[PDB]
Coordinates of C-alpha atoms in Angstrom, one line a residue:
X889 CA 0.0 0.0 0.0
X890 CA 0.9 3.2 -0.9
X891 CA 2.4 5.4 2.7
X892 CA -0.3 8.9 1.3
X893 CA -2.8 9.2 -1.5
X894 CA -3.2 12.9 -2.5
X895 CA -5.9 15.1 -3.9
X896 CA -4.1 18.0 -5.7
X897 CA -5.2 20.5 -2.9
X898 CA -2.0 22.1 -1.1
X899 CA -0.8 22.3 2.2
X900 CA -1.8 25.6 3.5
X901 CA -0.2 28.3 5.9
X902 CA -1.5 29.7 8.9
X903 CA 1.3 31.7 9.7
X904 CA 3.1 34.4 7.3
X905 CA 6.5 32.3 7.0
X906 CA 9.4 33.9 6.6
X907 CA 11.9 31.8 4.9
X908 CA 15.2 34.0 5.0
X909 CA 17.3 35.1 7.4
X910 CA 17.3 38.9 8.8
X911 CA 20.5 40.3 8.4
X912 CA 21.1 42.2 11.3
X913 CA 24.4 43.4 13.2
X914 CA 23.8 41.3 16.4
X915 CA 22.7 37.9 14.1
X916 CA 26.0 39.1 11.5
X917 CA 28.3 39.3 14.6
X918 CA 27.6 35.6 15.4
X919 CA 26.7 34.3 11.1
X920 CA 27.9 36.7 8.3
X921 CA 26.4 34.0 5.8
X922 CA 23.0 34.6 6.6
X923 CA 22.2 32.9 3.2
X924 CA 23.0 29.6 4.4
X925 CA 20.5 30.1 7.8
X926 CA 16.9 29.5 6.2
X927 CA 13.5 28.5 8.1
X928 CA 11.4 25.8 6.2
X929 CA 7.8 26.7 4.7
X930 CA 4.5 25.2 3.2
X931 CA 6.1 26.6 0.0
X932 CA 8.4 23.4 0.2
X933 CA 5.6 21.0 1.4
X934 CA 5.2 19.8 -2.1
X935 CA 8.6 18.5 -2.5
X936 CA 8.4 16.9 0.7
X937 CA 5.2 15.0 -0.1
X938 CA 6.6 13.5 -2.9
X939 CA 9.3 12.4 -0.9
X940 CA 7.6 10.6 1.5
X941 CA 5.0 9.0 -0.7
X942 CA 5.9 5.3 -1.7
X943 CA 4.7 1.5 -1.6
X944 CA 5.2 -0.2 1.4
X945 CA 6.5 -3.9 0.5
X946 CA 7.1 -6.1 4.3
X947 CA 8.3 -9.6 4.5
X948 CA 8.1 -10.9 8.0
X949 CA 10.3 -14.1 9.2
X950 CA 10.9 -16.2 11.6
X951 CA 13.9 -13.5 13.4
X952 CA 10.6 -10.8 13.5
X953 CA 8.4 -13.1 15.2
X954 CA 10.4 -13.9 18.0
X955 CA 11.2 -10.7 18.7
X956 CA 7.7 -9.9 18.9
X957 CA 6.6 -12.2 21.1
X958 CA 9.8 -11.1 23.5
X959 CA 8.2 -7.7 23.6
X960 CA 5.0 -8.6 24.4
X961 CA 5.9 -11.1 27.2
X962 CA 8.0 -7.9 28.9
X963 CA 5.0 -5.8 28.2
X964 CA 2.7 -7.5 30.6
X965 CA 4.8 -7.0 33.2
X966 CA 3.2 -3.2 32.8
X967 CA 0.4 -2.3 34.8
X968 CA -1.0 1.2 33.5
X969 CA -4.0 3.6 34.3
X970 CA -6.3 5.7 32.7
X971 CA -5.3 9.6 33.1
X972 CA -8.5 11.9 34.3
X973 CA -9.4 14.4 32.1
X974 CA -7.5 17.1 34.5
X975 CA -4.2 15.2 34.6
X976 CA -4.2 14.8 30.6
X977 CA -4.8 18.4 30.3
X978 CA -2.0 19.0 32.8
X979 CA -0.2 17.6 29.9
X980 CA -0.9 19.7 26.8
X981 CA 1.9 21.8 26.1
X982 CA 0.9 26.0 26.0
X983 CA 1.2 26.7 22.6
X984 CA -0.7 23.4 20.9
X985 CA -2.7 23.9 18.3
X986 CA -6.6 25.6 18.8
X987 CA -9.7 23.0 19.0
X988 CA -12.0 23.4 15.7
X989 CA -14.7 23.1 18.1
X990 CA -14.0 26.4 20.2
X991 CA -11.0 26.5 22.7
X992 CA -7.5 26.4 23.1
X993 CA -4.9 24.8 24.6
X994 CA -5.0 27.8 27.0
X995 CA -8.4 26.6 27.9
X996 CA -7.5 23.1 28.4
X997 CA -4.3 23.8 30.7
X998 CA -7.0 26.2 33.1
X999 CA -9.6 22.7 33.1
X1000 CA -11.8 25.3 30.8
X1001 CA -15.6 24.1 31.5
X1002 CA -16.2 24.2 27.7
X1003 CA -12.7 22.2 26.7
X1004 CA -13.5 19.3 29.2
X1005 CA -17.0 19.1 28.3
X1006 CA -15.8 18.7 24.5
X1007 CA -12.9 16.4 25.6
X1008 CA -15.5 14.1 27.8
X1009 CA -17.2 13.6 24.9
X1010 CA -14.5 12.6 22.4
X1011 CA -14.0 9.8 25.0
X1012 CA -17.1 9.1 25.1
X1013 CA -17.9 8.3 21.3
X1014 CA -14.7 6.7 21.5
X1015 CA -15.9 4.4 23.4
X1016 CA -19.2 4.4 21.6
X1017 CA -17.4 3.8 17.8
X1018 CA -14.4 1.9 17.0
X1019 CA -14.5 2.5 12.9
X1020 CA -14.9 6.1 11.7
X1021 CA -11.7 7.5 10.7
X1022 CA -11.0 10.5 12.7
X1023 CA -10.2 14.0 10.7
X1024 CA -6.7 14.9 10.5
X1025 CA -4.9 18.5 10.2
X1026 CA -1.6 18.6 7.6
X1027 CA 0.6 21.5 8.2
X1028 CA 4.4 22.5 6.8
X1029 CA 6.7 22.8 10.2
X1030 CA 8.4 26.1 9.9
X1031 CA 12.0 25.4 11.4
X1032 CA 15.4 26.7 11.1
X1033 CA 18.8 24.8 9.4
X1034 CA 21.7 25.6 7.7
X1035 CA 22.1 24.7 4.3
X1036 CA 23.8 21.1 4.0
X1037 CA 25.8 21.4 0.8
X1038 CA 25.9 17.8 -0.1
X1039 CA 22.2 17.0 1.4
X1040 CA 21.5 19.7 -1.0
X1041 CA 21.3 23.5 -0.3
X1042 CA 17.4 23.6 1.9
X1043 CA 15.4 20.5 2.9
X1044 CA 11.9 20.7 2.1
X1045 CA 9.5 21.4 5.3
X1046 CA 8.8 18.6 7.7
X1047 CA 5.0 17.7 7.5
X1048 CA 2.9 17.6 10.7
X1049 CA 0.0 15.7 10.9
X1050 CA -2.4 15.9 13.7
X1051 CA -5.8 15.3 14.9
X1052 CA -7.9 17.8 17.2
X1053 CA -7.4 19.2 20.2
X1054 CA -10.4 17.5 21.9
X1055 CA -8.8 14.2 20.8
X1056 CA -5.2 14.6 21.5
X1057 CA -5.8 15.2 25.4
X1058 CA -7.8 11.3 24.9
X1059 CA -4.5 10.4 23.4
X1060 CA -2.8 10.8 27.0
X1061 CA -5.7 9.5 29.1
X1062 CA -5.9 6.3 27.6
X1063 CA -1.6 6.1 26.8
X1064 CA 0.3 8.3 29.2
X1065 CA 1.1 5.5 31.8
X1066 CA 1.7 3.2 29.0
X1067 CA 4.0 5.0 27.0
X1068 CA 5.3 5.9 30.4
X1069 CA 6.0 3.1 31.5
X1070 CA 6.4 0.4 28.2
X1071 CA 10.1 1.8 27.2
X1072 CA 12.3 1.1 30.2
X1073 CA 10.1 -2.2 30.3
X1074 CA 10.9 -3.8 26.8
X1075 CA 13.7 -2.1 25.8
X1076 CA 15.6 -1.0 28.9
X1077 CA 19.2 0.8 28.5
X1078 CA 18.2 1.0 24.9
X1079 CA 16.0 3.4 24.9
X1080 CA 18.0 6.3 24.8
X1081 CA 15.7 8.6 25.5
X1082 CA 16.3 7.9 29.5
X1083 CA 19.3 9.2 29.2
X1084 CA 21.2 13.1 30.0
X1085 CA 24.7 13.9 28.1
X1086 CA 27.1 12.7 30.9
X1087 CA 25.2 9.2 31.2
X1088 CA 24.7 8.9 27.2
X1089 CA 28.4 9.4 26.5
X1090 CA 28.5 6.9 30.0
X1091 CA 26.8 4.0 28.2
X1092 CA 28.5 4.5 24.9
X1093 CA 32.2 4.6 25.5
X1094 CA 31.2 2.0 28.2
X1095 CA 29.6 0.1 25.1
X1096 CA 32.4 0.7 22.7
X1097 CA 35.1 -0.8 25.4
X1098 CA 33.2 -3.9 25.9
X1099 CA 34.1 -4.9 23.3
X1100 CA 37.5 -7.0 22.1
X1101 CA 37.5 -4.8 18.8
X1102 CA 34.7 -2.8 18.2
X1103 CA 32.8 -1.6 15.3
X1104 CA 29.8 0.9 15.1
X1105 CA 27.5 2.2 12.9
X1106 CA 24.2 4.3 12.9
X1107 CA 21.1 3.2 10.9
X1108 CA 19.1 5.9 9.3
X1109 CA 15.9 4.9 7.7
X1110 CA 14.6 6.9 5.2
X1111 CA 11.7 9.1 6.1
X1112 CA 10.4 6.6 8.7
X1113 CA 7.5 7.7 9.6
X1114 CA 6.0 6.4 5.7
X1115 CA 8.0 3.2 6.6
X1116 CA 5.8 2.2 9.2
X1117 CA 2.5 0.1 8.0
X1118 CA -0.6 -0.6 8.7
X1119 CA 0.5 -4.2 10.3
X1120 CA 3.1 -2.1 12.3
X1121 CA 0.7 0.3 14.0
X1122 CA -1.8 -3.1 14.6
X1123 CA 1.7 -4.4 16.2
X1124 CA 1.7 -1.9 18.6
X1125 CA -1.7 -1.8 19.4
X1126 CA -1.4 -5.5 20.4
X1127 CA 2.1 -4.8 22.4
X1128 CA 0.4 -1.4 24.7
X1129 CA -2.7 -4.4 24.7
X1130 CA -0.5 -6.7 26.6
X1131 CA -0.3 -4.0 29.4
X1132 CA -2.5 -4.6 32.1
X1133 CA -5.3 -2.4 31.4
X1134 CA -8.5 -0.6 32.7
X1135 CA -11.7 -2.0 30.5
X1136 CA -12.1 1.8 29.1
X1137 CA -8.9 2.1 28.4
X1138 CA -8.4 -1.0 26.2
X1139 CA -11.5 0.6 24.0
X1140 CA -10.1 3.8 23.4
X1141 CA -6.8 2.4 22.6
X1142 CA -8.4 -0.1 19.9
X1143 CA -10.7 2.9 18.6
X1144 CA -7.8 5.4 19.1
X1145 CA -5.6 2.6 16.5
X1146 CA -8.4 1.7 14.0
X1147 CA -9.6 5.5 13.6
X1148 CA -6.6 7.6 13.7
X1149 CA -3.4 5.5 14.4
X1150 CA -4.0 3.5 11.3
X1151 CA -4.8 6.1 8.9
X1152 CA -7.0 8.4 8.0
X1153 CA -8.2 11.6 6.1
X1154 CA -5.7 14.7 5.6
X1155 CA -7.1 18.1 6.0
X1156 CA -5.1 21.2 5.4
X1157 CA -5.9 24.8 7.4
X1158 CA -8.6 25.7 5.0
X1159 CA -10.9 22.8 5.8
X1160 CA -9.9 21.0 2.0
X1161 CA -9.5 17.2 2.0
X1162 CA -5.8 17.1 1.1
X1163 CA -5.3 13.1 0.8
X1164 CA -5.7 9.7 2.9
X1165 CA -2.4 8.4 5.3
X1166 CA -1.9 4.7 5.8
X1167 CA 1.5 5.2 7.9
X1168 CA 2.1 7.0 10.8
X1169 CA 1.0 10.1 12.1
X1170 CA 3.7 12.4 12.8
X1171 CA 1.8 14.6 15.0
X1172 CA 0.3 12.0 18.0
X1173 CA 1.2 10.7 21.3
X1174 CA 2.4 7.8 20.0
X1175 CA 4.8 8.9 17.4
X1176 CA 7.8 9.1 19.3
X1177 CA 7.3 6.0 21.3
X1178 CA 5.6 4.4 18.7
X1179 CA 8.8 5.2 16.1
X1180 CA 11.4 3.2 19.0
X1181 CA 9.5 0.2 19.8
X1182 CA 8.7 -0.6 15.7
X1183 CA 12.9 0.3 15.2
X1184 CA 13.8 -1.8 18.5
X1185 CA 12.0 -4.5 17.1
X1186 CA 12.7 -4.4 13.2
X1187 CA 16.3 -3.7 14.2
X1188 CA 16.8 -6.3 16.8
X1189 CA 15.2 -9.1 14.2
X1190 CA 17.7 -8.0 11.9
X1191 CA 20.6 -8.3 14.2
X1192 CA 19.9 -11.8 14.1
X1193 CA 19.3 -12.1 11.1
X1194 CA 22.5 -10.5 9.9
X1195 CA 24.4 -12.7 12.5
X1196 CA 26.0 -9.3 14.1
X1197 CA 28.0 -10.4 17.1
X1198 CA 27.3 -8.7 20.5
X1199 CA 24.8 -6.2 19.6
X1200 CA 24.1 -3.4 22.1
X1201 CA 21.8 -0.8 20.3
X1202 CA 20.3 2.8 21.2
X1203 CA 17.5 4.0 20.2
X1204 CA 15.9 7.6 19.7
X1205 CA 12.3 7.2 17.7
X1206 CA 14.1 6.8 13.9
X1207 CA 17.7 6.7 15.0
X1208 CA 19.4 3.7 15.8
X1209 CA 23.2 3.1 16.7
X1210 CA 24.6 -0.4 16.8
X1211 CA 28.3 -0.8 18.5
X1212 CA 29.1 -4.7 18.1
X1213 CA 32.5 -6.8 17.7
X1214 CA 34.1 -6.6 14.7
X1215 CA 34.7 -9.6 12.7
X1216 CA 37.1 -8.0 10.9
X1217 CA 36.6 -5.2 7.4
X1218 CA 35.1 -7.8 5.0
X1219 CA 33.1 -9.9 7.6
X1220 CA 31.7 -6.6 8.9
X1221 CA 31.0 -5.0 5.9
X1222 CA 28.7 -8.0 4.6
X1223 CA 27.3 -8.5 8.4
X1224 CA 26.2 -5.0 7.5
X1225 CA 24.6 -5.3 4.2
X1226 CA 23.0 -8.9 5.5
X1227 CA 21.5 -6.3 8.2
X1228 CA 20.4 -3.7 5.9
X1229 CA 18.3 -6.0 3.9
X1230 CA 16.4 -7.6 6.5
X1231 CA 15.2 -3.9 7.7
X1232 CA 14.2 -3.5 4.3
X1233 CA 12.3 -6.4 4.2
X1234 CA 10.8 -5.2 7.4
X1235 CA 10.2 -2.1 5.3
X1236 CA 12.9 0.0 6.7
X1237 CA 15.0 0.8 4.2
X1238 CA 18.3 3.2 4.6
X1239 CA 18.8 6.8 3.0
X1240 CA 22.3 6.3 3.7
X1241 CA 25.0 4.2 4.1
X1242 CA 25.1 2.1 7.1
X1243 CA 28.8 2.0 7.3
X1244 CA 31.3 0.0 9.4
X1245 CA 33.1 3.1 11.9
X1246 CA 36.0 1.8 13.9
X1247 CA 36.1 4.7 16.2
X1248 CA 33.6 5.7 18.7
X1249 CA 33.8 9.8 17.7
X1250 CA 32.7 8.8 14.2
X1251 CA 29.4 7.1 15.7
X1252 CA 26.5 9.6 15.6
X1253 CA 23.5 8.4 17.8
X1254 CA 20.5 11.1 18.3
X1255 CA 22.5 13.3 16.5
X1256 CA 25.1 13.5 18.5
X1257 CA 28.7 11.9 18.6
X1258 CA 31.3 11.3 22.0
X1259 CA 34.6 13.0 21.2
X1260 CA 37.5 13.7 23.6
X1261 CA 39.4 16.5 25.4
X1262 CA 41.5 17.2 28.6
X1263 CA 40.3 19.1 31.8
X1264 CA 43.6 20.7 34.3
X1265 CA 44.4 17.1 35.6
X1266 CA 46.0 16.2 31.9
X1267 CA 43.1 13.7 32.4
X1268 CA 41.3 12.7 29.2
X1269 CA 37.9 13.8 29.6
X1270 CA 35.1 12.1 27.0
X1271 CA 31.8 14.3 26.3
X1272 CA 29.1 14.2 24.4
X1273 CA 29.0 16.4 20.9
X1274 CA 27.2 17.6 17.9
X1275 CA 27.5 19.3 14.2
X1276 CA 27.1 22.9 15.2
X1277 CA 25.7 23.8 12.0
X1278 CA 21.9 23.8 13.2
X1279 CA 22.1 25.2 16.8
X1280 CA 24.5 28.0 15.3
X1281 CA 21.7 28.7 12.9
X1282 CA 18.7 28.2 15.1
X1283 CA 21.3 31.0 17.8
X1284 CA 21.3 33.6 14.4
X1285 CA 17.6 33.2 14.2
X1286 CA 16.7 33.7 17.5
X1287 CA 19.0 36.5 17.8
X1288 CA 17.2 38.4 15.2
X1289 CA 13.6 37.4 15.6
X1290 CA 12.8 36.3 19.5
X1291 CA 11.5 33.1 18.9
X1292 CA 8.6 30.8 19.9
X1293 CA 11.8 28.1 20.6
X1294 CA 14.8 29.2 23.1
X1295 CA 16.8 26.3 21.5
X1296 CA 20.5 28.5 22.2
X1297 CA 19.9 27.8 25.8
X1298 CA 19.0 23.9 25.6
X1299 CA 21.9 23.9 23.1
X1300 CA 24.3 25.8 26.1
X1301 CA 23.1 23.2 28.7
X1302 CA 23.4 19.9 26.9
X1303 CA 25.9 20.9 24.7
X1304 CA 28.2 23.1 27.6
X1305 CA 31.7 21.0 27.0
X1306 CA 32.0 21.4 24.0
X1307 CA 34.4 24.4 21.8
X1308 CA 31.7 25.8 20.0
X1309 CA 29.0 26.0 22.8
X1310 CA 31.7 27.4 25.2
X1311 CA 33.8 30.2 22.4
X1312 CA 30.8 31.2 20.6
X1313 CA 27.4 30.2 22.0
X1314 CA 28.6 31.6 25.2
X1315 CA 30.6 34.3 24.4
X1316 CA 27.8 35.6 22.1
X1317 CA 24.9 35.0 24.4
X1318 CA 26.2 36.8 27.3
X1319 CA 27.2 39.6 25.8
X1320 CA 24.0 40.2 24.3
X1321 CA 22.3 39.6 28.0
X1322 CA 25.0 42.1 29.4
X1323 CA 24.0 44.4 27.2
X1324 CA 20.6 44.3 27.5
X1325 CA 21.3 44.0 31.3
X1326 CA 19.3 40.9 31.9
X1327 CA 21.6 38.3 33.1
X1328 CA 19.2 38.6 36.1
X1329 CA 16.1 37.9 33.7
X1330 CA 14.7 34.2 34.1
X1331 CA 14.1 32.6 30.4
X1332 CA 12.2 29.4 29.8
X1333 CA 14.2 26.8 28.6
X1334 CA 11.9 23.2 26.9
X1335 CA 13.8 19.5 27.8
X1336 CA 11.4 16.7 27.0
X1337 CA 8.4 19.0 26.5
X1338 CA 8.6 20.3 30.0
X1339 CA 9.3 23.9 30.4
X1340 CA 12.2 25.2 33.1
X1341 CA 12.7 28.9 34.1
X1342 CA 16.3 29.3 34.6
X1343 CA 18.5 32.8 35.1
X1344 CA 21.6 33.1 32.8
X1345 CA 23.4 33.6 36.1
X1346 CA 22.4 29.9 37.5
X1347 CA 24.5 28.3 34.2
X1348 CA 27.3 27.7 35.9
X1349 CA 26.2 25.5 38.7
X1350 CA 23.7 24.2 35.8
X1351 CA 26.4 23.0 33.6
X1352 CA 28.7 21.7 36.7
X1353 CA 25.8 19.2 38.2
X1354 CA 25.1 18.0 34.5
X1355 CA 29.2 17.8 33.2
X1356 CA 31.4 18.3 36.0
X1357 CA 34.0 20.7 37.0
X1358 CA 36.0 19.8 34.3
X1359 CA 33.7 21.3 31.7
X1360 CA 35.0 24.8 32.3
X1361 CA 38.4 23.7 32.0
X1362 CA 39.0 21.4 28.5
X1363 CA 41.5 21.6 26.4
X1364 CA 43.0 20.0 23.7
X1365 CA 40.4 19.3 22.0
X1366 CA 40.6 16.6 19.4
X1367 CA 41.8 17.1 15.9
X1368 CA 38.7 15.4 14.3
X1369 CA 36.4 17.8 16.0
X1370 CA 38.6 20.8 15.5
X1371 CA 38.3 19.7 12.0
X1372 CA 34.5 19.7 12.3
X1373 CA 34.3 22.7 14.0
X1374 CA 36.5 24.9 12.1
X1375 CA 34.5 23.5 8.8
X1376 CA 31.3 24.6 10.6
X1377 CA 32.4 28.1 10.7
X1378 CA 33.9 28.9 7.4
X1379 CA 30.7 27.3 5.9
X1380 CA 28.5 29.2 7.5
X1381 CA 30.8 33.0 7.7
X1382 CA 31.1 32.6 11.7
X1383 CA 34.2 34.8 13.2
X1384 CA 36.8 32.2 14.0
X1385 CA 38.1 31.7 17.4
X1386 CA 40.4 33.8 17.6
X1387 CA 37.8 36.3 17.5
X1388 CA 35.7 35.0 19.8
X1389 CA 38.7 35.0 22.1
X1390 CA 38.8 37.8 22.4
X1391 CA 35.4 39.2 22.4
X1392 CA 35.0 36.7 25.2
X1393 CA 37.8 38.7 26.9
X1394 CA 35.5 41.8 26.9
X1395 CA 32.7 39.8 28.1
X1396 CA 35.1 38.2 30.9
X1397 CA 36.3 41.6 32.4
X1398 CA 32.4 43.2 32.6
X1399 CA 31.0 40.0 34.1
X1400 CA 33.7 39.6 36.3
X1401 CA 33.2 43.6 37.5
X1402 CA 29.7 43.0 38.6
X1403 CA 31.1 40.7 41.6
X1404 CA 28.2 37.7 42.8
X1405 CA 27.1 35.2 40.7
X1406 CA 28.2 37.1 37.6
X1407 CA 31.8 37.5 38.6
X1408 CA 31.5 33.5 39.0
X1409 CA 30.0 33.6 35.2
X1410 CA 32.7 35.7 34.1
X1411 CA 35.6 32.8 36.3
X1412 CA 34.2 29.5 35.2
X1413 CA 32.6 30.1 32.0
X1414 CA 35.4 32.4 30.2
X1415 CA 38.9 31.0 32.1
X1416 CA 39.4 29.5 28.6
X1417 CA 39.4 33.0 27.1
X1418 CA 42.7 34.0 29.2
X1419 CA 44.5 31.2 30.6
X1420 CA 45.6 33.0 34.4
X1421 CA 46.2 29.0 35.2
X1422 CA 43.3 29.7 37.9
X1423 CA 42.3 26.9 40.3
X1424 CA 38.7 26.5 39.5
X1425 CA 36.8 24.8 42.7
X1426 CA 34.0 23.1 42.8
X1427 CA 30.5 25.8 43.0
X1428 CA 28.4 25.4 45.8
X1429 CA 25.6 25.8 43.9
X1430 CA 25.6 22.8 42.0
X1431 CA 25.4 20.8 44.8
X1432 CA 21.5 21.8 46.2
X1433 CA 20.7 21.1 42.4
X1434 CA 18.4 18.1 41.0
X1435 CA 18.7 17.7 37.2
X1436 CA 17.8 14.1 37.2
X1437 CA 14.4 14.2 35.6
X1438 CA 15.5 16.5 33.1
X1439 CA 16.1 13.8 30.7
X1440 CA 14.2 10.9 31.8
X1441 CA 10.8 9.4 30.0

């Protein structure tokens, strides 16, 4: 079956959409290519539908089944509730999309009288009919990149797809304590979702020396979301059905599978039937979930079939990373392509490579790779990483236009060891919150879909309770991310770091004037801009601090 059927009507816009970049002094003082920084549109919602439109062929052996039946035997070991209505709308983030039938999510977070009334009786004819497809909204995401020369100057919009209000807050009362509690369950330390930065780059160079001689790769499915089948979603249905269940709750699950999960009618934002989906929605409360369980379980079938040797996987929806023993080049190289055509048999075929990496920094697992560097004690210190391309652009853009996102500051947190989040992020950052005198200005920050409020000034403690002292002290970084890094920044026109260093000196001495907790910005976050050889102790701060369910389910 084919993954969409289309009408000929288009995917619509809400919003105005600007694609470009604004030049600007302040986003040309981090990115002087502001050509390369785009945002995607519904213009480019076209390209992307043909892209994701294909037949589905699946094959499903012997290696499938059992897997399958492992899963469900470690999914009854769940027991999981029903939500009420006032703990599912606890959940719905503040800026989901409007009802069709009269409220927002606004209304739903304040238990709005007229929201519940219209979310009681979604459940309800849930409950009552288990066969009408359900309505769906298409919409173009509008997000920022930087142009990937050799994925090919801008990628088309992402497409959302998303049923209403009213029935998304059903999606959590009948599947919040399931999707909750399922992961960890079946998968354990490969969901990698559970993870923070410290404990991912923990489990991975713990992984990689496991082995005798290790080999790695990553496994990226192209557009995986289409991949997925009607026989996969069914799959799932009967896994969360393994869970021990309230009665109501197994009903609105079934109803929740057959009239929305399965597939169903496209609408776009001016009501026009737009085509039919037989794959998975991108836009429910399964998606992400749904995406790691179907990969866990095509991937770890295919493991077996390929006869891989000592698999230990991670997963992240789509992504997949495999670090295994090597059988040496040849042997792994054919293991590899014996792998690759079982997924596609399972209908998930690659967009690129998988190939055989034989060192850990070249592994990239929710994109992100471990690389290496020193802290004062010569000791080698290993930390997790990413391209810098995006975050750089997403920092330009939310420079110029304050944004709906805040991404610079989840990028500072998570990404707080690194040379480009320390010379430039940083730098950059605080000098504009010096100059606009807020360092004392709480910002929300997003991690999981929960919202923080966090003052600039608290980063320091922040970063030392998630990295360790020894993030504000690296050095000697290595030449593979150097490499990486300083590639990142003539592509894109950012000042090199020599610039930055000295910028950051600036930044240092005004911080460091202000005494308190901006002189201790100014000391921890910036000794890399002068070198004094200063003995940086351990803040007090990060001790009171918990952190912990920051990166959890």
């Amino acid at each position: 079956s084919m993954s969409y059927s289309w009408t000929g009507a288009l995917v619509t816009p809400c919003a105005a959409e600007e694609s470009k970049l604004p030049i600007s002094p302040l986003s040309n003082s981090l990115l002087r290519h502001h050509n390369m920084v785009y945002a995607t549109t519904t213009r480019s919602a076209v390209t992307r539908q043909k892209k994701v439109t294909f037949d589905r062929l699946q094959v499903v052996d012997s290696h499938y089944n059992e897997v399958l039946k492992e899963i469900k035997a470690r999914a009854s070991r769940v027991k999981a509730r029903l939500l009420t209505t006032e703990e599912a709308c606890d959940l719905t983030p503040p800026h989901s999309a409007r009802s069709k039938f009269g409220y927002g999510a606004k209304d739903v977070r304040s238990h709005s009288r007229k929201a519940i009334n219209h979310i009681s009786s979604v459940w309800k004819d849930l409950l009552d009919d288990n066969n009408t497809p359900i309505p769906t909204t298409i919409m173009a995401k509008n997000e920022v990149f930087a142009v990937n020369p050799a994925k090919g100057g801008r990628k088309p919009a992402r497409l959302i797809v998303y049923p209403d209000l009213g029935v998304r807050v059903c999606e959590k009362r009948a599947l919040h304590d399931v999707i909750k509690k399922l992961p960890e369950a079946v998968m354990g330390a490969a969901y990698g979702f559970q993870y923070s930065p410290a404990q991912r780059v923990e489990f991975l160079l713990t992984a990689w020396k496991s082995k005798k001689t290790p080999m790695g790769f990553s496994y990226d499915t192209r557009c995986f979301d289409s991949t997925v089948t009607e026989k996969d979603i069914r799959v799932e249905e009967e896994v969360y059905q393994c869970c021990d269940l309230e009665p109501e709750a197994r009903k609105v699950i079934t109803a929740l599978t057959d009239r929305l999960y399965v597939g169903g009618p496209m609408h776009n934002s001016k009501g026009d039937l737009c085509g039919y989906r037989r794959c998975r929605a991108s836009g429910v409360y399964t998606t992400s979930f749904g995406n790691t369980l179907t990969c866990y379980l095509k991937a770890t079938a295919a493991i077996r079939a390929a006869g891989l040797r000592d698999c230990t996987m991670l997963v992240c929806g789509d992504d997949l990373v495999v670090i295994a023993e090597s059988d040496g080049v040849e042997e792994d190289n054919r293991a590899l392509r014996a792998f690759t055509e079982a997924m596609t048999r399972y209908s998930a075929p690659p967009g690129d490579a998988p190939q055989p990496a034989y060192d850990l920094e070249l592994i990239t697992s929710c994109s992100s790779n471990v690389s290496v560097a020193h802290d004062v004690t010569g000791k080698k210190v290993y930390y997790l990483t990413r391209d810098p391309e995006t975050p750089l652009a997403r920092a330009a853009w939310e420079t110029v236009r304050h944004t709906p996102v805040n991404s610079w500051l989840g990028n500072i947190i998570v990404y707080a060891p690194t040379i480009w989040v320390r010379m430039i992020l940083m730098t950059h950052f605080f000098s504009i919150l010096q100059s606009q005198e807020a360092l004392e200005k709480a910002l929300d920050f997003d991690m999981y879909g929960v919202t923080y409020s966090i003052t600039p000034l608290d980063l320091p403690a922040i970063i030392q309770r998630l990295h360790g002292l020894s993030a504000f002290t690296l050095h000697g970084y290595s030449p593979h991310e150097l490499n990486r890094v300083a590639g990142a920044l003539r592509k894109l026109g950012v000042p090199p770091l020599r610039a930055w260093r000295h910028r950051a000196r600036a930044v240092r001495a005004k911080l460091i004037a202000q005494g308190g907790r901006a002189k201790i910005c100014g000391i921890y976050l910036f000794n890399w801009a002068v070198k004094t050889k200063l003995k940086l102790t351990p803040l007090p701060a990060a001790a009171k601090l918990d952190l912990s369910g920051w990166f959890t389910v």
